Design a protein around this ligand. Structure first.
Ligand code: HEM
Ligand code: HEM
Ligand SMILES: C[C@@]1(c2ccc(Oc3ccccc3)cc2)OC(=O)N(Nc2ccccc2)C1=O
Lengths: 109, 377, 47, 79
């Protein structure tokens, strides 16, 4: 249940990395998880972050909102590099989705 | 002293002075206040025109000319009204586009109220246009009214009901004057309800990301941003009134009444063009009017088709391309709606009609889903 | 057909002339007040 | 509605700012602005512009066919 690497996977990665650059949130210093739409599952995931991450995301978002108002971007040297982009919210979000889905399955019986 | 305690200024303060607003809202956000200015504009000039217009079949066309020739400055007031109606639609369009692009429709209630506000002003402008009893006013009134006749089983009792007769005549011009006078007051109430629901969450912004960490007071900032932008709405309005009074105005309304003779090529106002093309595309009575209704009523399905993990389209290259293809498609519908129902045009007009719906009901939502996958979300 | 024709363009003149005064001025009023935000600087200093 | 003081929690960020009467309202209006607009233009042309040239091309063709097909036409009816 493992071995493979592929020139193709790199193409897929290359297509993702391409879109990531095209999306452009990294020009504002943002990270992927900073751009997620806050629905309830998400608000709760934000709520569960430890202080450091919680604070970092706040500052990044402020930095971006401030750029947006000036319609500027960060120097290229400071864009968030795909692959240096931390999925910090994911595991909390996945867990909050799991527990909700559990509640839902209980509500069915 | 205080703005905060007085039962009245407290509303003002909470709506225009201390309301926390995103530091980053764009020019695209100016349209809501411009829509308010439009409504007030229509209201004032509308009113002064009512102090001189008469609603009877005979003197209708005439009283309007009385205004443009005899009544002091009626011409300027009349043109501001007409050109104000166009601006109002220009603003609706931008405002609705801004909401789509930026995901603002996710504020369910306020977006749903907006749709109602859209239909209300369209109803309003229609009744308005009929008022001078010109050729297009009459035939346009005849076309649009007859749509209702497509409705199965009760279709004809309804048109005759709304007519107050056997065709658009006397009774209709008078009732249209009446409904056209009250509608903007009713619009005004819906707009306050629109603004109420919006304040519950405050404004969205270009990034689609919460701005609670970077809110600024509506007052000094949006107060001046709105002023500046009002002056721009005004320049654009005056340019029309003062240099191109007849530019959007069809030459045929400058000729009275002909229930006997339909003009060779009747052409909608402008802001109905795209919808007119859609209705026309399909060679069916029922299906045309159904397609027509759906063409506008679709806005309320938009929220169910949101598929992306992001709110705005700011970081969404695919959706962006499809959005503009939508705009470009509407612009095509506009061109086509103003053209004769013939060879190159009917086919172009049918393909643009499937595209409009194809891209809203299927293309956009599929782009959102592949953008998510591309991001590993 | 259009008796107002001549007054309208005299007004029209005044509208561009006035607009050409007010536009730059109102624009400058807004930049003045927005100065504070446009040049503001941020710094994050976590523990 | 929501009020300043009850929006959200923020820790550790300093904001430095100047009085309007102390700064310029248009600093490098052209020096920095022009470059900036060129840059925002580049960033969006590929998404905005194409659908419109597509309409443009169909606009000119469409009218071209219309004229040549109906009016101009009466082509051959030879006897
Ligand atoms: C305060 C409520 C309103 C009143 C009392 C009012 C009054 C009038 C009157 C008396 C006319 C016939 C005179 C003329 O044609 O110039 C008219 C025409 C019209 N009004 Fe209104 N109106 C009101 C709100 C609106 C609204 C909301 C709109 C939509 C923006 C609107 C757009 C029109 C249009 C398109 C016409 C036909 C203009 C033309 O070409 O002559 N008005 N209105
Ligand atoms: C009488 C017609 C309308 C009036 C008077 C009106 C007025 C306003 C005002 C004052 C705002 C505040 C900020 C801004 O400028 O964006 C706003 C925002 C908004 N309106 Fe309207 N609008 C009208 C038509 C519509 C329509 C047709 C829709 C959608 C069908 C709509 C849905 C929204 C939404 C979703 C927002 C959210 C703000 C954002 O996300 O940026 N409104 N409107
Ligand atoms: C101004 C106008 C009008 C006003 C509001 C409308 O409302 C809508 C606008 C867009 C989409 C749906 C409805 C439609 C037409 O009223 C009117 O008599 N016409 N003229 C007309 C000409 C040919 C066919 C049908 C109508 C309008 O354009």
């Amino acid at each position: 249940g493992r071995p493979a690497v592929s020139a193709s996977s790199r193409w897929l990665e290359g297509i993702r990395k391409w879109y990531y650059n095209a999306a452009g949130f990294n020009k504002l210093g943002l990270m992927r998880d900073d751009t997620i739409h806050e629905n309830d599952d998400v608000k709760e995931a934000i709520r569960r972050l430890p202080e450091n991450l919680y604070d970092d995301r706040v500052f990044r978002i402020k930095r971006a909102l401030d750029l947006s108002m000036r319609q500027q971007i960060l120097p290229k040297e400071q864009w968030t590099k795909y692959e240096e982009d931390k999925s910090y919210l994911e595991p909390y979000l996945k867990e909050v989705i799991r527990e909700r889905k559990e509640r839902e399955e209980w509500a069915k019986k | 002293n205080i703005r905060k305690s007085h039962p009245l200024m407290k509303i003002v303060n909470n709506a225009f002075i201390d309301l926390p607003a995103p530091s980053n809202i764009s020019s695209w956000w100016n349209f809501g206040s411009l829509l308010g200015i439009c409504l007030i504009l229509q209201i004032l000039t509308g009113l002064f025109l009512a102090m001189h217009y008469t609603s009877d079949t005979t003197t209708a066309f005439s009283s309007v000319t009385h205004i443009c020739r005899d009544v002091n400055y009626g011409w300027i007031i009349r043109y501001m009204h007409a050109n104000g109606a166009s601006m109002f639609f220009i603003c609706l369009y931008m405002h609705v586009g801004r909401g789509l692009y930026y995901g603002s429709y996710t504020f369910l209630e306020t977006w749903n109220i907006g749709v109602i506000l859209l239909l209300t002003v369209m109803a309003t402008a229609f009744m308005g246009y009929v008022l001078p009893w010109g050729q297009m006013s009459f035939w346009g009134a005849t076309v649009i009214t007859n749509l209702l006749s497509a409705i199965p089983y009760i279709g004809t009792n309804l048109v005759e009901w709304i007519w107050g007769g056997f065709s658009v005549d006397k009774a209709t011009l008078t009732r249209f004057f009446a409904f056209h006078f009250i509608l903007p007051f009713i619009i005004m109430a819906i707009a306050m309800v629109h603004l109420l629901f919006l304040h519950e969450t405050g404004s969205n912004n270009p990034t689609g990301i919460s701005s609670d960490v970077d809110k600024i007071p509506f007052h000094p900032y949006y107060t001046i941003k709105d002023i500046l932008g009002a002056l721009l709405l005004i320049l654009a309005l005056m340019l029309l009134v003062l240099f191109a009074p007849d530019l959007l105005g069809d030459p045929d309304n400058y000729t009275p009444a002909n229930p006997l003779n339909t003009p060779p090529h009747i052409k909608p106002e402008w802001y109905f063009l795209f919808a007119y093309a859609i209705l026309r595309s399909i060679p069916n009575k029922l299906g045309g009017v159904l397609a027509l209704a759906f063409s506008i009523l679709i806005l309320a399905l938009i929220p169910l088709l949101h598929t992306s993990k992001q709110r705005s389209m700011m970081f969404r290259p695919l959706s962006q391309c499809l959005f503009w293809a939508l705009v470009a498609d509407l612009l095509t519908l506009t061109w086509i709606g103003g053209q004769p129902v013939e060879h190159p045009y009917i086919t172009i007009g049918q393909l643009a009609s499937v595209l409009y719906f194809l891209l809203i009901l299927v293309l956009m939502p599929t782009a959102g889903t592949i953008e998510n996958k591309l991001l590993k979300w | 057909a259009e008796p107002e024709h001549d007054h309208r363009k005299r007004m029209g003149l005044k509208m561009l002339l006035m607009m050409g005064l007010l536009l730059p001025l109102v624009y400058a009023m807004k930049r003045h007040k927005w100065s504070v935000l446009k040049s503001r600087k941020l710094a994050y200093r976590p523990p | 509605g929501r009020q300043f003081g009850h929006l959200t929690r923020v820790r550790h960020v300093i904001t430095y700012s100047l009085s309007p009467f102390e700064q310029r309202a248009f600093p490098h209006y052209f020096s920095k602005g022009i470059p900036n607009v060129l840059r925002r233009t580049r960033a969006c042309i590929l998404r905005v512009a194409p659908p419109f040239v597509a309409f443009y091309l169909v606009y000119t063709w469409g009218t071209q066919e219309f004229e040549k097909s109906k009016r101009k036409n009466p082509a051959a009816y030879e006897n």
